[PDB]
Amino acid sequence: PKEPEQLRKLFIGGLSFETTDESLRSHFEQWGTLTDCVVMRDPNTKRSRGFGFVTYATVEEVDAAMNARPHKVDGRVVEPKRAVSRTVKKIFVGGIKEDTEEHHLRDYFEQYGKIEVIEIMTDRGSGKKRGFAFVTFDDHDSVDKIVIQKYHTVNGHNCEVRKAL
Ligand SMILES: N[C@H]1CCN(S(=O)(=O)c2ccccc2)C1
């Protein structure tokens, strides 16, 4: 069974107006099989709108494409983003109770991306742990991967994870 197509599609912004379906495909096929690849154009002029979409056969291929950033396509560095995830670098992690420590969160989340800050929330008056935390990554794709997952188990706790603004 295939991963849902909606989780295999990347929005590609910042395109050169000279990029075509064919040149976009030729570039992004280097990181996987593309089941679809389109440059968005004006309906009347056919002039590029400066963005497009590529759909890979597997989520692993999406990951490979994102890990190969920065992508310079037809002379311009473009901006890939997962098209469906339901742009920030920070998550709320709730439900971690009082026994979850920084190393629990780091050991778990470091496989989603490079962590820059872990903030375990404590009570302003007592210093007791409040049972939630914030994790900041160096890049948004980590967060997009994280919030797409249905489940997050950290330190034996079933955690609620959301984007933090
Ligand atoms: N309930 C089904 C309906 C669609 N999917 S999905 O494509 O796996 C998905 C997962 C996470 C975020 C956005 C989409 C699950």
UniProtKB/Swiss-Prot annotation:
<feature type="cross-link" description="Glycyl lysine isopeptide (Lys-Gly) (interchain with G-Cter in SUMO2)">
    <location>
        <position position="2"/>
    </location>
</feature>
<feature type="cross-link" description="Glycyl lysine isopeptide (Lys-Gly) (interchain with G-Cter in SUMO2)">
    <location>
        <position position="163"/>
    </location>
</feature>
<feature type="domain" description="RRM 2">
    <location>
        <begin position="89"/>
        <end position="165"/>
    </location>
</feature>
<comment type="function">
    <text>Involved in the packaging of pre-mRNA into hnRNP particles, transport of poly(A) mRNA from the nucleus to the cytoplasm and modulation of splice site selection. Plays a role in the splicing of pyruvate kinase PKM by binding repressively to sequences flanking PKM exon 9, inhibiting exon 9 inclusion and resulting in exon 10 inclusion and production of the PKM M2 isoform. Binds to the IRES and thereby inhibits the translation of the apoptosis protease activating factor APAF1. May bind to specific miRNA hairpins.</text>
</comment>
<feature type="cross-link" description="Glycyl lysine isopeptide (Lys-Gly) (interchain with G-Cter in SUMO2)">
    <location>
        <position position="72"/>
    </location>
</feature>
<feature type="region of interest" description="Globular B domain">
    <location>
        <begin position="87"/>
        <end position="165"/>
    </location>
</feature>
<comment type="subunit">
    <text>Identified in the spliceosome C complex. Identified in a IGF2BP1-dependent mRNP granule complex containing untranslated mRNAs. Interacts with SEPT6. Interacts with C9orf72. Interacts with KHDRBS1. Interacts with UBQLN2. Interacts with PPIA/CYPA. Interacts (via the RGG-box) with the HOXB-AS3 peptide; the interaction inhibits binding of HNRNPA1 to the intronic sequences flanking exon 9 of the PKM gene, preventing inclusion of exon 9 and promoting inclusion of exon 10 which suppresses formation of the PKM M2 isoform and promotes production of the M1 isoform.</text>
</comment>
<feature type="modified residue" description="Phosphoserine">
    <location>
        <position position="16"/>
    </location>
</feature>
<feature type="cross-link" description="Glycyl lysine isopeptide (Lys-Gly) (interchain with G-Cter in SUMO)">
    <location>
        <position position="97"/>
    </location>
</feature>
<feature type="region of interest" description="Globular A domain">
    <location>
        <begin position="1"/>
        <end position="86"/>
    </location>
</feature>
<comment type="function">
    <text>(Microbial infection) May play a role in HCV RNA replication.</text>
</comment>
<comment type="subunit">
    <text>(Microbial infection) Interacts with HCV NS5B and with the 5'-UTR and 3'-UTR of HCV RNA.</text>
</comment>
<protein>
    <recommendedName>
        <fullName>Heterogeneous nuclear ribonucleoprotein A1</fullName>
    </recommendedName>
</protein>
<feature type="domain" description="RRM 1">
    <location>
        <begin position="8"/>
        <end position="86"/>
    </location>
</feature>
